[PDB]
Scaffold this active site. Structure first.
Site, PDB file in Angstrom:
ATOM      1  N   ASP A  17       0.772  -1.244  -0.153  1.00 20.56           N
ATOM      2  CA  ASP A  17      -0.144  -0.082   0.010  1.00 20.56           C
ATOM      3  C   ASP A  17       0.759   1.114   0.127  1.00 20.56           C
ATOM      4  O   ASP A  17       0.427   2.270  -0.016  1.00 20.56           O
ATOM      5  CB  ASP A  17      -0.866   0.034   1.303  1.00 20.56           C
ATOM      6  N   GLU A 113      -2.856  -5.635   0.246  1.00 21.11           N
ATOM      7  CA  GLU A 113      -3.515  -6.029  -1.187  1.00 21.11           C
ATOM      8  C   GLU A 113      -4.092  -7.233  -1.227  1.00 21.11           C
ATOM      9  O   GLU A 113      -4.761  -7.478  -2.262  1.00 21.11           O
ATOM     10  CB  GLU A 113      -2.411  -6.298  -2.334  1.00 21.11           C
TER      11      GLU A 113
HETATM   12 MN   LIG Z   1       0.028  -2.280  -4.436  1.00 18.50          MN
HETATM   13 MN   LIG Z   2      -4.909  -1.817   1.108  1.00 19.27          MN
END
Ligand SMILES: [Mn+2]
Ligand SMILES: [Mn+2]
Length: 188
Positions: A17, A113
């Site tokens: 992230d 993710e």
């Molecule tokens: Mn990513």
């Molecule tokens: Mn996330």
DNA sequence: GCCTTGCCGGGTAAGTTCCGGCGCG
DNA sequence: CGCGCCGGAACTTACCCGGCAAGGC
């Protein structure tokens, strides 16, 4: 070592992230950022920043943890050239992760993710080679899995955990106490 | 008659890089 | 003068979500 574990978890969030940025400015000023983004402010202030602050302290880095509010998400940011290369070097030596670091990485990668509802066990990313690494790690841990091109529009591959081993996956990897506990794993 | 899972579109929660400061040798 | 920490936020899209339907058992 516990420091190795927190590091690998944090790295999973970062690659998931966030990222590692080597900035060059006018002039010739520069900056090195270690960054995680998240929509939730509690998750950054309460679960991520404490882990990063511990690591900052165990490496005698005295940058501070910045939390910037943006339009669409909060940014946990450390502006440190030493912390940048600590994570960068870790990323290039990632296939040499021992098993404790493997579970911790997959943990943080899944937080960032990953399919957070756990009705299905999926993880998205455009980096097919990084998902193949994780795929080998899961197999050696007995969690069968597959990689297909989930999104043809943007070229995003998906690693699907076979649900056959869903309890092996959630209890062994997302719930291990030998390194930091994910958001929804600490309850269950 | 379920379940698993490849595929796909919706759009938000991510990601990336500029800005303008300052500090220090 | 050269380089590295703060603090902000504008600018695109890569994730996630969740539906559908084909395929196993
Ligand atoms: Mn990513
Ligand atoms: Mn996330």
């Amino acid at each position: 070592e516990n420091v190795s574990g927190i590091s690998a978890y944090l790295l999973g969030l970062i690659i998931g992230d966030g990222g590692l940025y080597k900035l060059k400015y006018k002039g010739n000023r520069s900056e090195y950022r270690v960054v995680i983004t998240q929509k939730s402010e509690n998750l950054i202030k309460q679960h991520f920043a404490p882990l990063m602050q511990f690591l900052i302290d165990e490496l005698n880095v005295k940058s501070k943890i910045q939390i910037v509010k943006g339009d669409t998400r909060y940014e946990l940011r450390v502006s440190s050239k030493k912390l940048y290369y600590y994570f960068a070097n870790m990323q290039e030596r990632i296939r040499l992760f021992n098993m404790r670091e493997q579970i911790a990485f997959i943990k943080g990668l899944y937080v960032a993710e990953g399919d957070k509802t756990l009705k299905r066990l999926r993880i998205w990313n455009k980096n097919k080679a990084l998902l193949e690494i994780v795929s080998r790690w899961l197999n050696n841990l007995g969690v069968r899995n597959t990689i297909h091109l989930d999104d043809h529009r943007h070229g995003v591959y998906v690693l699907n955990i076979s649900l056959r081993d869903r309890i092996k996956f959630v209890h062994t990897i997302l719930s291990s106490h030998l390194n930091p506990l994910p958001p929804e794993a600490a309850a269950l």
